[PDB]
Design a protein around this nucleic acid. Sequence first.
RNA 1: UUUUUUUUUUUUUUUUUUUUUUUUUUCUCCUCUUUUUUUUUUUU
Length: 70
Amino acid sequence: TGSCAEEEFHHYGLALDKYTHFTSPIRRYSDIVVHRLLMAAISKDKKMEIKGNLFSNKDLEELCRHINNR
RNA sequence: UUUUUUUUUUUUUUUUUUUUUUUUUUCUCCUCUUUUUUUUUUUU
């Protein structure tokens, strides 16, 4: 995300401007990330706090390079 | 009518000890050929 600029967020091959998967938490790894985050989102718009941290910049970038490799 | 004598199975038992798997060689060595390397996408 905000590690880069907006222009580098698009999904040109599909004419979208943002595209990921969320339909497979089981056979992949970015999707469990998306699960934790989506549930943090549905859980955060109540004005409370989600104890237990989630990620950081460097952690996410090393994870995404690992996933590219794999 | 044929008496008397010529030994036998070595003696001994009431001695201390503080180590340790194995063990010891063999040299440098020409990997052949459409490629940059493909890559989104969805159904597990």
